[PDB]
Amino acid sequence: FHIPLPGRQSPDHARAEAEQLAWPRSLGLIRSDAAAERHLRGGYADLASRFYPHATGADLDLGVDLMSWFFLFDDLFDGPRGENPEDTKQLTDQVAAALDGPLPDTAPPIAHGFADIWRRTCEGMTPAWCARSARHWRNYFDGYVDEAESRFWNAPCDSAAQYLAMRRHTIGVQPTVDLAERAGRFEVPHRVFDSAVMSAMLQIAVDVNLLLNDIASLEKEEARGEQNNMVMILRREHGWSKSRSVSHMQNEVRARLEQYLLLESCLPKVGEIYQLDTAEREALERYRTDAVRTVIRGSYDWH
Ligand SMILES: [Mg+2]
Ligand SMILES: [Mg+2]
């Protein structure tokens, strides 16, 4: 890896991988043997075990379930639904409703799956934590509506800045990191979560994932005529070739990873600034190592 973040994987990964189909199957999310085979080919329990190496048993299963759900949910916007913000919001409203209370049994399977994840996610977490993580979920769903609006008007982004304002929410990294707290039964001190230093660290985590994702998905997205990929956007913004745009993105990933270390080195002083007590310093260290560092490296290793 470009910076010395250790590669990690939950020791309980084999069982979580072997049992991963039971949950989406029970919820109606995988409707056939063919769909199950397709799901296993994604390696989503493997991904979860790298984001959540500190989790085992039911806590790791929740992480596997979140990964499974992310990809099954995203599938629902592959076709015409993703081209229309009214149709996209019709679905995302039904899913996001789970944040406000129970769902009617007529709600779509993907909404019931979300509701079950969110129910488990909130267990043992402070009300203030649940409210914040719910806000992150609503940012995510609103981002899906914004993406469908762009597709509807055939209006792809013309700058990296405009693209990032949307993709930083649809990439789903912040809810992934939120789950790492729940999966580890800890909470980073809330005033430090809000800090400028931690905000920058999290933005790096989000950005590194979305940039690597756009490189990994480039050829598939080119074949579908997708225009909201950082490579295509940089070509429009700067006149660059796609080749120079990829190289720019690679340089940006490396530079941001190096900045991540710098920001990490500020955390001792940040803890002093916010007068963290002993338990709070321990919780911040769990967040740094088990939530932020893991999400930065987990997707890289998964590919
Ligand atoms: Mg898909
Ligand atoms: Mg899509």
Short mmCIF file of C-alpha atoms and ligand atoms in Angstrom, two decimals:
data_model
loop_
_atom_site.label_atom_id
_atom_site.label_comp_id
_atom_site.label_asym_id
_atom_site.label_seq_id
_atom_site.Cartn_x
_atom_site.Cartn_y
_atom_site.Cartn_z
CA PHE A 1 0.00 0.00 0.00
CA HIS A 2 1.11 3.57 -0.74
CA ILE A 3 1.08 4.43 2.98
CA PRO A 4 1.71 2.03 5.90
CA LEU A 5 -1.89 1.12 6.68
CA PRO A 6 -1.96 -2.59 7.59
CA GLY A 7 -4.05 -4.99 5.58
CA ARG A 8 -6.56 -6.60 7.93
CA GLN A 9 -9.36 -9.14 7.81
CA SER A 10 -11.72 -10.43 10.46
CA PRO A 11 -10.62 -13.85 11.76
CA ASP A 12 -14.28 -14.91 11.42
CA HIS A 13 -14.38 -14.21 7.66
CA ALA A 14 -14.79 -17.86 6.60
CA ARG A 15 -18.02 -18.41 8.55
CA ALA A 16 -19.42 -15.01 7.58
CA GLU A 17 -18.68 -15.76 3.92
CA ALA A 18 -20.24 -19.23 4.13
CA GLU A 19 -23.46 -17.99 5.77
CA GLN A 20 -23.84 -14.72 3.83
CA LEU A 21 -26.82 -15.78 1.71
CA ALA A 22 -29.23 -16.57 4.55
CA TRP A 23 -30.07 -12.96 5.37
CA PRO A 24 -30.79 -11.55 1.86
CA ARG A 25 -32.63 -14.76 1.00
CA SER A 26 -34.90 -14.42 4.03
CA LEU A 27 -35.77 -10.86 3.03
CA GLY A 28 -36.67 -11.66 -0.59
CA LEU A 29 -33.59 -9.93 -2.01
CA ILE A 30 -32.20 -12.95 -3.86
CA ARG A 31 -34.94 -14.66 -5.83
CA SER A 32 -33.17 -17.57 -7.54
CA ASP A 33 -30.13 -19.79 -7.67
CA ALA A 34 -28.80 -17.65 -10.51
CA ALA A 35 -29.18 -14.49 -8.41
CA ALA A 36 -27.44 -16.19 -5.48
CA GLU A 37 -24.52 -17.26 -7.68
CA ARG A 38 -24.24 -13.69 -8.99
CA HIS A 39 -24.24 -12.42 -5.41
CA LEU A 40 -21.50 -14.82 -4.26
CA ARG A 41 -19.36 -13.69 -7.21
CA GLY A 42 -19.34 -10.18 -5.73
CA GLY A 43 -17.28 -11.24 -2.71
CA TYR A 44 -19.28 -8.94 -0.44
CA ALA A 45 -18.63 -10.88 2.77
CA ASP A 46 -14.94 -10.68 1.91
CA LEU A 47 -15.34 -6.91 1.54
CA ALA A 48 -17.15 -6.68 4.89
CA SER A 49 -14.44 -8.67 6.65
CA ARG A 50 -11.85 -6.14 5.50
CA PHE A 51 -13.88 -3.07 6.49
CA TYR A 52 -14.72 -4.70 9.84
CA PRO A 53 -11.72 -6.83 10.91
CA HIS A 54 -12.56 -6.07 14.56
CA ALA A 55 -15.99 -7.72 14.18
CA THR A 56 -16.96 -11.38 14.49
CA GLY A 57 -20.16 -13.36 14.79
CA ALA A 58 -23.35 -11.35 14.60
CA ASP A 59 -21.48 -8.03 14.46
CA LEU A 60 -19.57 -9.13 11.39
CA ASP A 61 -22.79 -10.56 9.92
CA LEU A 62 -24.30 -7.08 10.18
CA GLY A 63 -21.38 -5.74 8.17
CA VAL A 64 -21.78 -8.48 5.58
CA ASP A 65 -25.49 -7.65 5.41
CA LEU A 66 -24.74 -3.96 4.86
CA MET A 67 -22.39 -4.80 1.98
CA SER A 68 -24.91 -7.22 0.45
CA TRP A 69 -27.63 -4.60 0.79
CA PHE A 70 -25.55 -1.82 -0.78
CA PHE A 71 -25.01 -3.78 -3.96
CA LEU A 72 -28.53 -5.21 -4.19
CA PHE A 73 -29.97 -1.73 -3.62
CA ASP A 74 -27.73 -0.14 -6.23
CA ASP A 75 -28.86 -2.78 -8.76
CA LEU A 76 -32.35 -1.28 -8.64
CA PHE A 77 -31.12 1.85 -10.43
CA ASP A 78 -29.36 0.03 -13.29
CA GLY A 79 -32.39 0.36 -15.55
CA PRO A 80 -35.00 3.04 -16.18
CA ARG A 81 -35.51 3.81 -12.48
CA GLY A 82 -32.05 5.37 -12.35
CA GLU A 83 -32.89 7.70 -15.25
CA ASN A 84 -35.75 9.44 -13.45
CA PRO A 85 -35.60 11.24 -10.09
CA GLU A 86 -39.34 10.83 -9.47
CA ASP A 87 -39.06 7.05 -9.85
CA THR A 88 -35.80 6.98 -7.90
CA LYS A 89 -37.23 9.04 -5.04
CA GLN A 90 -40.38 6.91 -5.03
CA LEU A 91 -38.15 4.00 -4.01
CA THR A 92 -35.65 5.85 -1.80
CA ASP A 93 -38.49 7.45 0.18
CA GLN A 94 -39.85 3.99 0.93
CA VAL A 95 -36.44 2.80 2.11
CA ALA A 96 -35.56 5.93 4.11
CA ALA A 97 -38.94 5.72 5.83
CA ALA A 98 -37.42 2.96 7.97
CA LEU A 99 -35.46 5.68 9.79
CA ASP A 100 -38.75 7.15 11.04
CA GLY A 101 -40.62 4.03 12.11
CA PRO A 102 -41.77 0.56 11.07
CA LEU A 103 -42.60 -0.19 7.47
CA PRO A 104 -45.86 -1.66 6.14
CA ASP A 105 -45.46 -5.21 4.96
CA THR A 106 -46.26 -4.02 1.41
CA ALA A 107 -42.98 -2.08 1.35
CA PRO A 108 -40.42 -3.40 -1.17
CA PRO A 109 -38.01 -6.14 -0.04
CA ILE A 110 -35.05 -3.76 -0.33
CA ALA A 111 -36.79 -1.44 2.14
CA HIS A 112 -37.41 -4.26 4.63
CA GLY A 113 -33.75 -5.25 4.28
CA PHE A 114 -32.66 -1.71 5.04
CA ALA A 115 -35.04 -1.54 8.01
CA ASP A 116 -33.54 -4.71 9.44
CA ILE A 117 -29.98 -3.40 9.05
CA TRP A 118 -30.96 -0.08 10.61
CA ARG A 119 -32.74 -1.79 13.52
CA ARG A 120 -29.60 -3.77 14.31
CA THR A 121 -27.34 -0.78 13.66
CA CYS A 122 -29.00 1.30 16.37
CA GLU A 123 -28.73 -1.38 19.09
CA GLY A 124 -26.72 -0.09 22.04
CA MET A 125 -25.89 3.21 20.30
CA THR A 126 -26.60 6.60 21.83
CA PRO A 127 -29.65 8.51 20.54
CA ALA A 128 -27.35 11.29 19.34
CA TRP A 129 -25.35 8.70 17.38
CA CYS A 130 -28.49 7.27 15.78
CA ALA A 131 -29.69 10.74 14.76
CA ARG A 132 -26.32 11.49 13.14
CA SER A 133 -26.07 8.17 11.34
CA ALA A 134 -29.66 8.60 10.16
CA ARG A 135 -28.66 11.96 8.67
CA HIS A 136 -25.83 10.21 6.80
CA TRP A 137 -28.35 7.73 5.42
CA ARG A 138 -30.65 10.51 4.24
CA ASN A 139 -27.68 12.23 2.57
CA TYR A 140 -27.01 8.94 0.78
CA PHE A 141 -30.59 8.54 -0.47
CA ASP A 142 -30.82 12.21 -1.47
CA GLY A 143 -27.63 11.65 -3.47
CA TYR A 144 -29.32 8.84 -5.40
CA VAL A 145 -32.14 11.23 -6.31
CA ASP A 146 -29.64 13.87 -7.38
CA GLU A 147 -27.85 11.33 -9.59
CA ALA A 148 -31.12 10.35 -11.25
CA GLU A 149 -31.86 14.03 -11.83
CA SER A 150 -28.54 14.37 -13.65
CA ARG A 151 -29.36 11.33 -15.79
CA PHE A 152 -32.89 12.59 -16.45
CA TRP A 153 -31.66 15.89 -17.88
CA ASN A 154 -28.68 14.22 -19.58
CA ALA A 155 -26.59 16.76 -17.68
CA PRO A 156 -23.37 15.15 -16.47
CA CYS A 157 -21.07 17.11 -14.22
CA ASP A 158 -18.66 19.57 -15.81
CA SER A 159 -16.28 19.83 -12.86
CA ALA A 160 -14.74 17.54 -10.28
CA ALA A 161 -16.15 19.87 -7.61
CA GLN A 162 -19.73 19.45 -8.79
CA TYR A 163 -19.25 15.69 -9.14
CA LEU A 164 -17.75 15.26 -5.68
CA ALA A 165 -20.64 17.18 -4.10
CA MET A 166 -22.89 14.31 -5.24
CA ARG A 167 -20.63 11.25 -5.36
CA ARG A 168 -19.28 11.78 -1.84
CA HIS A 169 -22.79 10.90 -0.72
CA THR A 170 -23.72 8.08 -3.08
CA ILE A 171 -20.48 6.13 -2.59
CA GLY A 172 -21.78 5.06 0.83
CA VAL A 173 -18.50 5.34 2.69
CA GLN A 174 -19.82 7.32 5.65
CA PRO A 175 -22.53 4.74 6.50
CA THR A 176 -19.86 2.05 6.10
CA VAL A 177 -17.68 3.86 8.65
CA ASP A 178 -20.69 4.43 10.92
CA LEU A 179 -21.29 0.68 10.96
CA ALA A 180 -17.68 0.09 12.05
CA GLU A 181 -18.49 1.89 15.31
CA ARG A 182 -21.60 -0.21 15.88
CA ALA A 183 -19.75 -3.41 14.89
CA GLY A 184 -17.06 -2.58 17.45
CA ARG A 185 -19.49 -1.45 20.19
CA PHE A 186 -17.85 1.96 20.53
CA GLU A 187 -18.50 5.59 19.60
CA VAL A 188 -15.84 8.09 18.65
CA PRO A 189 -16.44 11.17 20.86
CA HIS A 190 -19.04 13.21 19.03
CA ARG A 191 -17.23 16.53 19.32
CA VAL A 192 -14.21 14.90 17.68
CA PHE A 193 -16.32 13.34 14.94
CA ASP A 194 -17.38 16.91 14.16
CA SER A 195 -13.82 18.29 14.34
CA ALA A 196 -12.18 19.87 11.33
CA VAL A 197 -9.34 17.34 11.51
CA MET A 198 -11.60 14.29 11.62
CA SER A 199 -13.86 15.80 8.94
CA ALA A 200 -10.81 16.03 6.67
CA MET A 201 -9.76 12.46 7.48
CA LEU A 202 -13.22 11.19 6.65
CA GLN A 203 -13.30 13.20 3.42
CA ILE A 204 -10.04 11.53 2.40
CA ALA A 205 -11.56 8.12 3.15
CA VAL A 206 -14.61 8.99 1.04
CA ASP A 207 -12.53 10.44 -1.81
CA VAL A 208 -10.01 7.60 -2.01
CA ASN A 209 -12.85 5.10 -2.28
CA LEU A 210 -14.79 7.01 -4.91
CA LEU A 211 -11.69 7.71 -7.02
CA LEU A 212 -10.55 4.08 -6.91
CA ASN A 213 -14.13 3.04 -7.70
CA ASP A 214 -14.26 5.23 -10.81
CA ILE A 215 -10.98 3.78 -12.08
CA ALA A 216 -12.09 0.20 -11.41
CA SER A 217 -15.50 0.75 -13.06
CA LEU A 218 -14.23 2.82 -15.99
CA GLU A 219 -14.50 0.26 -18.78
CA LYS A 220 -17.89 -1.04 -17.67
CA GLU A 221 -19.20 2.51 -17.42
CA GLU A 222 -17.73 3.50 -20.80
CA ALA A 223 -19.60 0.56 -22.36
CA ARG A 224 -22.87 1.94 -20.94
CA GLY A 225 -22.14 5.52 -22.02
CA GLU A 226 -21.94 6.66 -18.39
CA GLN A 227 -20.75 10.26 -18.15
CA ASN A 228 -20.67 10.82 -14.36
CA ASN A 229 -17.34 9.15 -13.77
CA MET A 230 -14.41 11.28 -12.63
CA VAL A 231 -12.42 10.28 -15.72
CA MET A 232 -15.03 11.59 -18.16
CA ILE A 233 -15.67 14.65 -16.00
CA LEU A 234 -12.01 15.65 -15.89
CA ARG A 235 -11.86 15.36 -19.67
CA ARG A 236 -14.72 17.85 -19.92
CA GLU A 237 -13.42 20.13 -17.17
CA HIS A 238 -9.83 20.41 -18.44
CA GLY A 239 -9.75 19.07 -22.02
CA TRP A 240 -7.48 16.24 -20.85
CA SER A 241 -7.28 12.83 -22.45
CA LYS A 242 -8.83 10.00 -20.49
CA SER A 243 -5.28 8.72 -19.98
CA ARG A 244 -4.09 11.96 -18.35
CA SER A 245 -7.28 12.09 -16.28
CA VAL A 246 -6.65 8.63 -14.84
CA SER A 247 -3.06 9.61 -14.04
CA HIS A 248 -4.32 12.75 -12.30
CA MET A 249 -6.72 10.67 -10.21
CA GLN A 250 -3.93 8.28 -9.26
CA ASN A 251 -1.76 11.21 -8.17
CA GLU A 252 -4.69 12.57 -6.16
CA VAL A 253 -5.23 9.26 -4.36
CA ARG A 254 -1.54 9.11 -3.44
CA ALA A 255 -1.41 12.74 -2.32
CA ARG A 256 -4.53 12.37 -0.18
CA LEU A 257 -3.23 9.17 1.42
CA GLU A 258 -0.06 11.06 2.36
CA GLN A 259 -2.19 13.88 3.77
CA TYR A 260 -4.17 11.30 5.74
CA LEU A 261 -1.01 10.47 7.71
CA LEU A 262 -0.38 14.16 8.43
CA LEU A 263 -3.92 14.60 9.73
CA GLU A 264 -3.62 11.44 11.82
CA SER A 265 -0.51 12.90 13.44
CA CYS A 266 -2.66 15.82 14.66
CA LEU A 267 -5.01 13.57 16.63
CA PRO A 268 -3.04 13.66 19.94
CA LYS A 269 -3.35 17.46 20.00
CA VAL A 270 -6.98 17.24 18.83
CA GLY A 271 -7.72 15.00 21.81
CA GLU A 272 -6.14 17.59 24.10
CA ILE A 273 -8.07 20.42 22.44
CA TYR A 274 -11.35 18.60 23.07
CA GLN A 275 -10.23 17.53 26.57
CA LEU A 276 -10.96 13.86 25.93
CA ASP A 277 -11.00 11.65 29.01
CA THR A 278 -9.37 8.24 29.08
CA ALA A 279 -12.33 6.28 27.72
CA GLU A 280 -12.81 8.90 24.99
CA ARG A 281 -9.17 8.73 23.90
CA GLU A 282 -9.57 4.95 23.66
CA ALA A 283 -12.72 5.37 21.57
CA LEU A 284 -10.95 7.82 19.25
CA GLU A 285 -8.13 5.30 18.77
CA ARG A 286 -10.68 2.58 17.94
CA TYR A 287 -12.23 4.93 15.38
CA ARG A 288 -8.85 5.72 13.81
CA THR A 289 -7.76 2.09 13.53
CA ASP A 290 -10.95 0.05 13.19
CA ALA A 291 -13.23 2.45 11.27
CA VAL A 292 -11.28 5.04 9.26
CA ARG A 293 -8.06 3.17 8.39
CA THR A 294 -10.02 0.02 7.57
CA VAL A 295 -12.40 1.77 5.16
CA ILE A 296 -9.43 3.41 3.43
CA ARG A 297 -7.66 0.13 2.77
CA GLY A 298 -10.51 -2.38 2.71
CA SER A 299 -11.83 -1.67 -0.78
CA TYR A 300 -8.33 -1.57 -2.26
CA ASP A 301 -7.55 -5.04 -0.88
CA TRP A 302 -10.99 -6.33 -1.89
CA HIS A 303 -10.22 -5.51 -5.52
MG MG B 1 -24.97 -3.82 -9.43
MG MG B 2 -26.15 3.02 -11.07
#
